Write a protein that binds this ligand. Structure first.
Ligand SMILES: CCCCCCCCCC(=O)N(CCO)C[C@@H](O)[C@@H](O)[C@@H](O)[C@@H](O)CO
Ligand SMILES: CCCCCCCCCC(=O)N(CCO)C[C@@H](O)[C@@H](O)[C@@H](O)[C@@H](O)CO
Ligand SMILES: CCCCCCCCCC(=O)N(CCO)C[C@@H](O)[C@@H](O)[C@@H](O)[C@@H](O)CO
Ligand SMILES: CCCCCCCCCC(=O)N(CCO)C[C@@H](O)[C@@H](O)[C@@H](O)[C@@H](O)CO
Ligand SMILES: Nc1nc2ccc(OC(F)(F)F)cc2s1
Ligand SMILES: Nc1nc2ccc(OC(F)(F)F)cc2s1
Ligand SMILES: Nc1nc2ccc(OC(F)(F)F)cc2s1
Ligand SMILES: Nc1nc2ccc(OC(F)(F)F)cc2s1
Ligand SMILES: [Cl-]
Ligand SMILES: [Cl-]
Ligand SMILES: [Cl-]
Ligand SMILES: [Cl-]
Ligand SMILES: [Cl-]
Ligand SMILES: [Cl-]
Ligand SMILES: [Cl-]
Ligand SMILES: [Cl-]
Ligand code: NA
Ligand code: NA
Ligand code: NA
Lengths: 255, 255, 255, 255
């Protein structure tokens, strides 16, 4: 009965998605080729047109979408917003056009759900992250005061110290490159660095594991709802309802 | 009543498996000795005959098998196919004969099941892997543009950048060897590299954990079915059936 | 009806907490600025007053608290004790004032619960930690005896050996920096170092995983009790009570 | 009524255990002091007597034990056997006496149970370990053939290659120290090394996680049985028995 309705049906098809995916990939491949500094002037010119085309197909797509759903209903979705900004900002002649390839995530549903699970897991680890942040800040202040005068390249100011401490937490050359040189001047520096490592590696892995365990559960419920309209009821609710059926046959057997 | 049937019984015995295992090991040991560049001409000649023998015993084995199961029923199995190719390609006088030792996996059932679990887990992490791939590709394009002119050995082209970024994701000399040298020329490069590390280490570990958790469950169900013909019913189905027995005694107590 | 009661209500408000949080942050920011060695004499003087103020607001706070709860009831809490010491020791004109910023943990409840979970998990991994400790001590004695005379910088005495072995367990330059140089003199040293690595990396990760899995469960029960006054009953107790309702309807249907 | 019985009661007391623990620690402390190469002749002499004493107290202990339980019942226990060998071999005037300190594990029950869980978990990961072993062996043969002539220090023979590949699997200097130098001569060597890393890091972590998850469950059941004489019934058996109580009230309500 309606134009709008027939467009939404197009937008939401599997073929349309495949086509926009193919254009993202192509845009991506062309921006990759353009890294090649040896290119002829005409080749670069060509590739830049392919990019122009890709960007155009993107504006038609988003247009189609803002029409078929209306200004307020398109902007209802973070993903549409994201798609919109990514495409919009390219219409302002920043220099990292290649971020356009993140649209593979916004356009492919299973990929969107991976990202959604990870974003959704961030709140629940916020206290673990804050504890890490506090540990970092305190360590960076002490390292600057302790070591900044004698090791200024690594600890000369707070910024330097944070950088160095991040390197130390990743275990990268922590000993041969940082702590042994420091200990030649400050023999007890292991008393600072080895507890720092123990605590940050424990906390970071806590942070990581919390994100991953949650993100995987969220994603998995999203995949279920996407396929069947509902998710698995948690065992605890299943046992709750079993508790109810038991109450209703205990009460029924009064007489 | 049948030749075929008596051969299949041989093939499927525990003694036959032990014998083929022993020949794989021996083939493997001889290819190891042949790495020894100091060997006398006669020793090498000997070892090469032992390999020839090993390969022959393999053709008889596979023959036995294609006969006792017929062309279409042998080629029904990925493992038979794999065994077939590995042995076949050696009959074309590639240079990595040592891959023959992967037959330890195809011939030993518990080992086959480990590999089966890992292959079977690959689909379920395909979106996590694709997200990693996207992150890599985008990072490699930006690193080439940002750093290729000033650091061409590490970022001079897309290939270089991908390699370097893989090294960076593994945390290997990421700071003393790559990022500190880069920052002497581009002082804000930590703004690129430290988020890259955070995101890829999170995603890779997500990838790893997903594979392992699934592969372990799959393998474990395979080990159960191999031993008893069935696996453990998931708790959720057990609770489902408990829900059914409750319905049938709630309905029965109508009167 | 009471002063005490109206103060406790202030102390326990959300606004009061926000205010003490803001003062910790500010104290923290000022101690950070003071790392900056380039500061004018007047700037340093200013910042030191801001610290003096911050410390004062802290004494009023703790005073308020010891009054509104009484000496014995304030000192009932580890966190109050901790808050008390941190603030008290600053009234003794040690040099790491920046530890004051750990009060973000004692004053923010969700952060307190993260730390509480980790402390509470320590007992249950105490045997895994002791095993690691034993492995370290034995390794450090043997490394000193084996390698101390020929590699005294790394193994010259027990202290040196422990340090080196910690570095080796973290995998930092273990081979190019320590074990290959050692093997040029003692060709079988891989027989010591590679088992050391296998065993300590297995044990440390066991230690880490045990802490994290437990700390996460404890923290999560604390967050529940903080919000609703109780936690989730473990599935095992739920099944226990289900077993009871079954007994009471099996016994009831005697006649 | 019996000597034997009163000795076993002594052996099995908490005070006796504390005393043997204290002697292990002391033996351990003295062997540590003896690493100190600067010691006076008389100090070393003293410490060596303390060791002699410690070893003597150990023989009385084991004697007490072989008597109070009899030759066949003492040798029934792996831990007694282990205690016996450790003490016995010292009566043969090998040079790593410090292994005596592993008796802290055999004498302290919670520590014994950690080790027991890890030993008991080894069978269930045997296939994952064998797969790793196969991957290593094949990689080491190919690396020797590919790279041995041009990089003999790292790949000159099978032993060298295994060592290098272990280093590579731990990610230690894998790129700046091994693979970049190799690629200057063999530009496609990343095609060998990067898949090697992906596969071995996945497999090793699978190995590690399998050991730890199992060892923790085993240990935890052992701690339960040690305290209460039984362990927790697995949920699956609890649900089985719930299924039985349901059958017995479905069958009972026939009439
Ligand atoms: C977890 C958070 C880790 C964040 C680290 C912050 C980096 C500091 C940013 C900064 O402002 N810098 C100063 C210039 O803008 C660069 C520093 O990173 C510093 O390391 C350099 O000065 C080195 O090149 C000197 O050795
Ligand atoms: C996660 C995917 C990581 C994949 C990495 C791809 C490697 C690039 C393959 C390639 O085509 N190369 C060019 C020649 O074929 C070799 C490069 O690896 C490159 O690093 C070398 O040019 C260095 O030797 C220079 O410093
Ligand atoms: C898991 C526990 C790891 C703990 C490590 C203890 C460190 C030893 C403390 C000590 O007393 N030292 C001697 C001076 O006080 C410093 C040593 O750390 C040592 O490494 C130095 O002498 C090096 O600078 C020489 O190469
Ligand atoms: C996962 C299993 C990793 C096991 C590694 C086996 C080590 C090899 C033992 C051996 O027999 N060697 C030869 C002498 O006995 C020593 C080698 O380790 C070798 O690396 C040395 O020759 C280097 O010093 C040369 O660069
Ligand atoms: N693979 C490995 N990673 C680590 C990280 C830390 C560690 O010790 C510490 F105390 F830091 F946790 C040992 C190891 S082994
Ligand atoms: N053993 C350890 N591995 C890592 C890996 C990453 C890390 O920080 C990051 F933000 F990258 F995750 C810290 C650590 S400690
Ligand atoms: N990322 C990785 N960390 C490790 C730690 C240890 C290891 O081998 C060992 F035997 F030590 F466990 C391999 C790896 S891969
Ligand atoms: N902390 C980290 N350890 C690893 C180990 C391997 C890895 O990539 C690979 F493909 F090897 F798994 C990335 C990372 S990040
Ligand atoms: Cl770009
Ligand atoms: Cl010092
Ligand atoms: Cl070969
Ligand atoms: Cl810059
Ligand atoms: Cl300070
Ligand atoms: Cl040696
Ligand atoms: Cl010793
Ligand atoms: Cl090559
Ligand atoms: Na590492
Ligand atoms: Na490293
Ligand atoms: Na390194």
């Amino acid at each position: 009965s309606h134009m709008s309705r027939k467009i939404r049906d197009l937008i939401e098809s599997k073929r349309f998605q495949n086509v926009i995916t193919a254009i993202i990939v192509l845009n991506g491949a062309v921006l990759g080729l353009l890294t090649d500094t040896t290119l002829s002037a005409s080749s670069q010119n060509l590739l830049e047109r392919v990019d122009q085309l890709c960007l155009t197909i993107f504006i038609v797509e988003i247009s189609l979408k803002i029409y078929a759903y209306g200004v307020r209903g398109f902007f209802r979705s973070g993903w549409n917003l994201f798609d919109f900004v990514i495409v919009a900002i390219a219409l302002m002649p920043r220099t990292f056009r290649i971020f356009r390839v993140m649209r593979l995530v916004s356009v492919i549903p299973t990929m969107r759900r991976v990202v959604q699970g990870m974003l959704l897991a961030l709140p629940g680890v916020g206290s673990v992250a804050a504890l890490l942040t506090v540990v970092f800040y305190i360590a960076a202040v002490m390292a600057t005061n302790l070591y900044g005068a004698t090791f200024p390249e690594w600890f000369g100011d707070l910024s330097k110290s944070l950088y160095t401490l991040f390197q130390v937490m990743t275990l990268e050359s922590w000993s041969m490159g940082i702590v042994r040189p420091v200990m030649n001047v400050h023999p007890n520096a292991w008393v600072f660095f080895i507890p720092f490592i123990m605590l940050t590696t424990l906390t970071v892995l806590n942070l990581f594991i919390g994100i991953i365990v949650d993100a995987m559960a969220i994603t998995k419920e999203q995949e279920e709802e996407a396929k069947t309209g509902h998710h698995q009821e948690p065992i605890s609710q299943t046992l709750l309802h079993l508790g109810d059926r038991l109450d209703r046959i205990e009460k029924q057997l009064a007489q």
